[PDB]
């Protein structure tokens, strides 16, 4: 469907906020950087707002369904998303038939999605030059709407299918011996709306 991306500039309270919440929830990772690279900051490039009227149209109508279902709380989250198809969600938007446990992934430390830009692990890393630590090449990552509704608490690593019954998402939390980051997951794409585009760097730190 036609999608339009609305720039928003640096100045702006909006843009601000989101660069506030990418930048002030990175941790360090158990796995030393490998996946995403070695960084304690971005360099923000481009934020732009998504615009696309039958995703939105598919989402505010599932946000109904939960919040009847719910108790009037549809409990909506701004949770990240990092993947290599950036490109089909914002024209075509989530969807679980790609998940390949099998649910939709979210999460609340931008740090965390950023090991998934490049694939699984990091893949190979960036394009061009074949590197999981690159601090070249923009890289692009989503801030969504995520309607979570009544979640299911675990510490165990998310191996279902769908959300309990009487839920609309599954929380894995983190606990000593456990995850290291919490997980964010649903079953159904029309669950999340991809409402920020953020073009970034990852940040080489400074030489002592
Ligand atoms: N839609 C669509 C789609 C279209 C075309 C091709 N692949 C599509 N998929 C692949 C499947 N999906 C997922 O979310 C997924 C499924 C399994 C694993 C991951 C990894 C993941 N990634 N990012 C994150 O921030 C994160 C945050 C916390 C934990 C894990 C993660 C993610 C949905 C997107
Ligand atoms: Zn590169």
């Given at each position: 469907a036609g999608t339009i991306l609305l720039d928003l500039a640096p100045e702006d309270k909006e843009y601000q906020s989101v660069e506030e919440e990418m930048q002030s929830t990175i941790r360090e990772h158990?796995?030393?950087?490998?996946?995403?690279?070695?960084?304690?900051?971005y360099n923000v490039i481009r934020i732009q707002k998504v615009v696309n009227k039958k995703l939105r149209e598919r989402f505010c109508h599932r946000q109904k369904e939960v919040s009847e279902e719910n108790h009037n709380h549809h409990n909506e989250r701004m949770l990240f998303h990092g993947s290599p198809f950036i490109n089909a969600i914002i024209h075509k938007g989530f969807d679980?038939?790609?998940?390949?446990?099998a649910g939709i992934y979210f999460a609340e430390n931008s740090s965390k999605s950023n090991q998934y830009v490049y694939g699984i692990?990091?893949?190979?890393?960036?394009?061009?030059?074949?590197?999981?630590?690159?601090?070249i090449c923009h890289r692009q990552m989503l801030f969504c709407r995520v309607t979570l509704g009544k979640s299911f608490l675990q510490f165990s690593t998310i191996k279902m299918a769908h959300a309990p019954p009487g839920h609309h998402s599954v929380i894995g939390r983190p606990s000593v011996n456990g995850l290291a980051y919490a997980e964010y997951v649903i079953y159904?794409?029309?669950?999340?709306?991809?409402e920020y585009l953020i073009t970034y760097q990852i940040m080489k730190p400074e030489a002592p």
């Open positions: 158990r796995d030393g950087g490998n996946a995403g690279g070695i960084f304690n900051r679980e038939r790609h998940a390949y446990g692990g990091g893949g190979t890393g960036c394009p061009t030059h074949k590197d999981r630590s690159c601090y159904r794409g029309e669950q999340a709306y991809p």
